[PDB]
Amino acid sequence: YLKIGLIKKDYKDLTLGISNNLLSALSGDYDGDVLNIIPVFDNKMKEHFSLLSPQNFLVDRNNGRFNGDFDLQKDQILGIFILNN
């Protein structure tokens, strides 16, 4: 359950700009495969489907701990490692 924050200003550009940390939860990569978008209109439906928001998936349901799928990807890991070590 995601939120639109920007409308792209170019008619030629037709690509959903998704955050990198979202890749692991989707179990997907930038191979060009198409993702499906279903807009949610009703406010009650918004509060009901908010359980699929990234915040609710931050807590890994197996261990009750932080989900590593929403943590840093390997490139971000390289950056942070260079910075701190």
Site for another protein in 18-77 (CB under 8 A): 19-21, 23, 27, 29-32, 34, 36, 38, 40-45, 48-49, 51-52, 54-56, 58-59, 61-66, 68, 70-77
User: Is there a contact between 28 and 18 (Cβ–Cβ < 8 Å)?
Assistant: no
Encoded tokens for 25 = 């939860």
Closest distance between another protein and the C-beta of residue 4, in Å?
Answer: 14
For tokens 């639109």, what's the residue?
Answer: 4
Q: Does 80 bind another protein (CB under 8 A)?
A: yes
User: Is there a contact between 69 and 23 (Cβ–Cβ < 8 Å)?
Assistant: no
Encoded tokens for 3 = 């939120």
Residues binding another protein (CB under 8 A): 12-15, 19-21, 23, 27, 29-32, 34, 36, 38, 40-45, 48-49, 51-52, 54-56, 58-59, 61-66, 68, 70-85
